Design a protein around this ligand. Sequence first.
Ligand SMILES: N#CCNC(=O)CN1Cc2ccc(Cl)cc2[C@H](C(=O)Nc2cncc3ccccc23)C1
Ligand SMILES: [Cl-]
Lengths: 305, 298
Amino acid sequence: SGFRKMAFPSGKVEGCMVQVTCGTTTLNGLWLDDVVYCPRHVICTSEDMLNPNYEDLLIRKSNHNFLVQAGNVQLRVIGHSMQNCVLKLKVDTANPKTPKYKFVRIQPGQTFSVLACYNGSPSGVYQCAMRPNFTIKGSFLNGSCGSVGFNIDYDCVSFCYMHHMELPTGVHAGTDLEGNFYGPFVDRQTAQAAGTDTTITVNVLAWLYAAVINGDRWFLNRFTTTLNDFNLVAMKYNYEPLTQDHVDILGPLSAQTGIAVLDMCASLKELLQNGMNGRTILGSALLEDEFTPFDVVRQCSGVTF
Amino acid sequence: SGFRKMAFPSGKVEGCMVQVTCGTTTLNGLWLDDVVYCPRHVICPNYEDLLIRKSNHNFLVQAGNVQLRVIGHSMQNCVLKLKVDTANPKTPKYKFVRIQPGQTFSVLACYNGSPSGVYQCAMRPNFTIKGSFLNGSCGSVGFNIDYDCVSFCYMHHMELPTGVHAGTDLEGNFYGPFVDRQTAQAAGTDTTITVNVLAWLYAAVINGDRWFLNRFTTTLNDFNLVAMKYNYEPLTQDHVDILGPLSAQTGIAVLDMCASLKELLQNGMNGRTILGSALLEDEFTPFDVVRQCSGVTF
Ligand SMILES: N#CCNC(=O)CN1Cc2ccc(Cl)cc2[C@H](C(=O)Nc2cncc3ccccc23)C1
Ligand SMILES: [Cl-]
């Protein structure tokens, strides 16, 4: 019993964290085999960030301008190349602690663990979701750039995010491990604002099924809804549209609890209308949207209470 | 910016997790040097009588794909200590410490000696933890990290009827009036960790959330009379002293913040949130706030 925001064990990722210094800038790098991956803005000054020409800044650099530190050992850089917004530093030593891994690009609504690092040293781990506006509501300070997001289903680490920047509203933006940004963001200090954020509907529904599995049904009603009627209501509360794919994905949880997806949708409609009336759902007074259908199935018991 | 329930990096603890099987029971063990620590209920009660019948070969210990050979066994309170023939080469620098209610820690939830998740939690005033554990989670451990040293503070033993969890320190002493057996055991009425709510209100101020601040202050006694009424733990002078650094950083005295907390208790949030929460959060200590709003590394 119980339901917590659970992160994956960070050990496999901790063994890959290094410190990258280029001039006066120091940030984090990911050391996998003989390559260190880090944000390309490590080659920038603060002044450069307004309108940086990364190709012009990079051509003026040699291998020995990049200092890479793994614990107390200095790694020797023997090559460098840029792939989108990430710098790839070829080092002379392969990481003996390289886990089995893949680079995966995630979609909004997907969750992942973040190992927040400073000076190549991990300081904390927390669970996140890629928001619909492509930002993450993280906890990052200056020096955290290069910190990574990941999932560890089975024994393989799937790296999905690398931290690049903080936006004016306190939220964060970054890239996949191929250097492609999530969202319409640039690694430039320009007028960049996160688009209006919305609630991840399929995740709130999954969390309502997790509440039913843990023995709570006070929020259920005797009504059902069409998919279109649900979306017309939910759009009024800044909720993401629920698609047929979302309904299909919620299939297993519907069969486990005996509550049809559109009947759970009717219950969500009523919660949006009434609020909780001093009650909580899984210890929360707000509707939780950072647990996917897959996270609920992984954490919760296979037997409904 | 941002404020998340952050756990310590779990790597140093992951390298210590093993699977312990005794008969039909399978649970988790902590392998440090040549000793595996696990809940004594793995032998299940008269624990001296059940243990005397057991031999070393009755205990199967598995570390990854390798079977460890048990060469000795002894009991310390509610913890079984299995002497193995191999020292853990991944043993970190460590201490066994007993925590107080209100203090927080990270939990590496494990099943079959394999870590599956990590989460942060607090020891409640009623000595239970609001964890997320399923059957097979027994032997999962709680810890904190200071520089390079792992301080083990909790080992999971059981789930109570209300869904909350009970366990021991690494010396086998239970937190709370609990026993390791099947009987009528219930968690006592819980209270809110006042010093932690105040720390979280300072974290909100640091992150730019000040709507709850007012021009008023309060005496410690007046605040405590109000706290006793909302099932909040009494705030002591030690708590006020511990909140000293956060008070100097934000310019808001502790009894000034206590006047804000009194108003939030008597009038609610009025449809507003604090750090994305509609409830007053009590599972972040003053030290956790200082650490997360300063970037301390391990
Ligand atoms: N608003 C705002 C923050 N902007 C700055 O104070 C300077 N930053 C400009 C800038 C512009 C673009 C890019 Cl790609 C990178 C950067 C860098 C950046 O965003 N780093 C940071 C990442 N995460 C958390 C942080 C918290 C506090 C301070 C800096 C953080 C430094
Ligand atoms: Cl995805």
